[PDB]
Amino acid sequence: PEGSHQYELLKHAEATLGSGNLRQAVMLPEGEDLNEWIAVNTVDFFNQINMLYGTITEFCTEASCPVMSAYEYHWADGTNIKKPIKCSAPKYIDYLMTWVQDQLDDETLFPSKIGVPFPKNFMSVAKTILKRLFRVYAHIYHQHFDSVMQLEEEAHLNTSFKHFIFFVQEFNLIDRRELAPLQELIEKL
Numbered sequence: 271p272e273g274s275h276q277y278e279l280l281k282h283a284e285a286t287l288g289s290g291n292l293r294q295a296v297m298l299p300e301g302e303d304l305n306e307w308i309a310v311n312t313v314d315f316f317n318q319i320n321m322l323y324g325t326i327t328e329f330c331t332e333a334s335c336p337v338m339s340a341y342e343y344h345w346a347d348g349t350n351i352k353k354p355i356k357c358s359a360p361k362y363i364d365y366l367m368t369w370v371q372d373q374l375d376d377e378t379l380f381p382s383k384i385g386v387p388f389p390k391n392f393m394s395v396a397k398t399i400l401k402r403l404f405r406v407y408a409h410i411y412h413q414h415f416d417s418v419m420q421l422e423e424e425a426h427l428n429t430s431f432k433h434f435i436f437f438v439q440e441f442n443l444i445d446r447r448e449l450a451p452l453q454e455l456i457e458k459l
């Protein structure tokens with residue numbers, strides 16, 4: 271969001287949330303690009319998750335999270351580690367969050383300059399990003415839930431999560447197989 275027309279699309283997605291009808295405020299506004307919309311909300315979801323998890327970092331440590339889990343996850347990003355290897359959740363989130371940032375920082379995928387079409391493979395990249403972000407949601411719901419309830423960050427995470435699930439559901443960016451944890455939750459909302 272160079273502060274340009276995406277910034278508006280961002281302030282779009284944010285402001286329209288006040289309706290309280292999430293199944294609507296997440297749809298493509300009339301005559302807007304799908305890839306652009308997905309890109310903008312993908313970024314805001316990245317920032318929201320990064321900040322939210324940032325609150326509980328002290329409660330998520332190498333001791334507190336021997337593994338990323340509820341369901342276990344091992345970081346094989348891609349190119350850099352082809353063989354999935356287990357590690358601590360703090361290491362895992364650090365790993366993936368940097369990876370998601372690099373996705374957002376690569377103009378082949380997320381261009382700043384307008385008029386440049388998104389890559390043809392895009393929305394495979396976006397779908398991947400959002401599944402990995404959902405895992406961060408999952409860690410925070412399963413193990414540190416009270417660590418928030420006690421903290422001041424509580425209804426923020428459920429609001430952002432409800433936004434997340436409603437959005438990805440509208441656009442089919444996350445497989446139901448990946449929503450297996452919290453499945454009890456995508457049902458409530």
Ligand SMILES: [Zn+2]
Nearest residue numbers: 330335359413
């Ligand atoms: Zn943890």
